[PDB]
UniProtKB/Swiss-Prot annotation:
Glycyl lysine isopeptide (Lys-Gly) (interchain with G-Cter in SUMO2) crosslink site(s): K27, K81
Protein's name according to its UniProt entry: Peptidyl-prolyl cis-trans isomerase A
Subunit structure, as described in the record: Interacts with protein phosphatase PPP3CA/calcineurin A. Interacts with PRPF19 isoform 2 (via N-terminus). Interacts with isoform 2 of BSG/CD147. Interacts with FOXO1; the interaction promotes FOXO1 dephosphorylation, nuclear accumulation and transcriptional activity. Interacts with integrin ITGA2B:ITGB3; the interaction is ROS and peptidyl-prolyl cis-trans isomerase (PPIase) activity-dependent and is increased in the presence of thrombin. Interacts with MAP3K5. (Microbial infection) Interacts with HIV-1 capsid protein.
Coiled coil start-end: none
Signal peptide: none
Effect of mutating T106A: No effect on peptidyl-prolyl cis-trans isomerase activity. Reduced interaction with BSG/CD147 and ability to induce leukocyte chemotaxis
Lineage: Eukaryota, Metazoa, Chordata, Craniata, Vertebrata
Entry PTM: Acetylation at Lys-124 markedly inhibits catalysis of cis to trans isomerization and stabilizes cis rather than trans forms of the HIV-1 capsid. PPIA acetylation also antagonizes the immunosuppressive effects of cyclosporine by inhibiting the sequential steps of cyclosporine binding and calcineurin inhibition. Acetylation at Lys-124 favors its interaction with TARDBP.
Disulphide-bridged cysteine pairs: none
GO terms for MF: cyclosporin A binding; heparan sulfate binding; integrin binding; peptidyl-prolyl cis-trans isomerase activity; RNA binding; unfolded protein binding; virion binding
Location(s) in or outside the cell: Cytoplasm; Secreted; Nucleus
Modified residues (Phosphothreonine): T92
PROSITE patterns associated with the record: CSA_PPIASE_1, CSA_PPIASE_2
Role according to the record: Catalyzes the cis-trans isomerization of proline imidic peptide bonds in oligopeptides. Exerts a strong chemotactic effect on leukocytes partly through activation of one of its membrane receptors BSG/CD147, initiating a signaling cascade that culminates in MAPK/ERK activation. Activates endothelial cells (ECs) in a pro-inflammatory manner by stimulating activation of NF-kappa-B and ERK, JNK and p38 MAP-kinases and by inducing expression of adhesion molecules including SELE and VCAM1.
Length: 163
């Protein structure tokens, strides 16, 4: 019953590969549904065409700002921001999909994909999914990141949707 969604990733407009995610709707249904609907674009806005604006090798890849395209924006399907649903799941290792935020109860659309166990984020960021297929594509994305997170090529979600 857990949905699966995909991102087709491009590097300076050339196809890199597809990352697929399981969304844990069984444990964080509101948060999973936000990400699912933003991936299909069914509300008329969402992840398609947006970029990964911060990639820090050995840490995580962050994206999801489709409103300002400068790291500060994005919005949820629930208006603007929404509350932290729960912190049942933890940042246990590579592939974990979690909500970016600016403190408590500020979930919008920005998210990050962990490439390592990041337990200092537990209880601060809502974990809601995991990479299902295409972790090798996330590893390739890291090669375009840097210590401070600026990317050396434009890393975009060329297409996305639900499987
Ligand atoms: C541009 O926005 C501002 C952020 C300023 C810069 C943060 C920064 C720069 C370089 C490396 C790192 C963080 C390392 O940590 C991450 O990479 C973490 C990893 C988990 C996901 N994540 N970033 C986030 O969720 C970060 C967590 C954060 C905020 C503030 C400072 C900080 O050190 C880390 N939050 C944000 O990016 C939110 C955004 C979702 C609307 N923006 C904001 O709070 C501000 C308005």
């Amino acid at each position: 019953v857990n949905p699966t969604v995909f991102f087709d990733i491009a590097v300076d407009g050339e196809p890199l590969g597809r990352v697929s995610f399981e969304l844990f709707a069984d444990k964080v249904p509101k948060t999973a549904e936000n990400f699912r609907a933003l991936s299909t674009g069914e509300k008329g806005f969402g992840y398609k065409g947006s970029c990964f604006h911060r990639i820090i090798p050995g840490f995580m890849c962050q994206g999801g700002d489709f409103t300002r395209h400068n790291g500060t924006g994005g919005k949820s399907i629930y208006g603007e921001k929404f509350e932290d649903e729960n912190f049942i799941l933890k940042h246990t290792g590579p592939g974990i999909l979690s909500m970016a935020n600016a403190g408590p109860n500020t979930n919008g659309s920005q998210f990050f994909i962990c490439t390592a166990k990041t337990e200092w984020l537990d209880g601060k960021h809502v974990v809601f999914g995991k990479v299902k297929e295409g972790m090798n594509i996330v590893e390739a994305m890291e090669r375009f990141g840097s210590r401070n997170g600026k990317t050396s090529k434009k890393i975009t979600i060329a297409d996305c949707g639900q499987l």
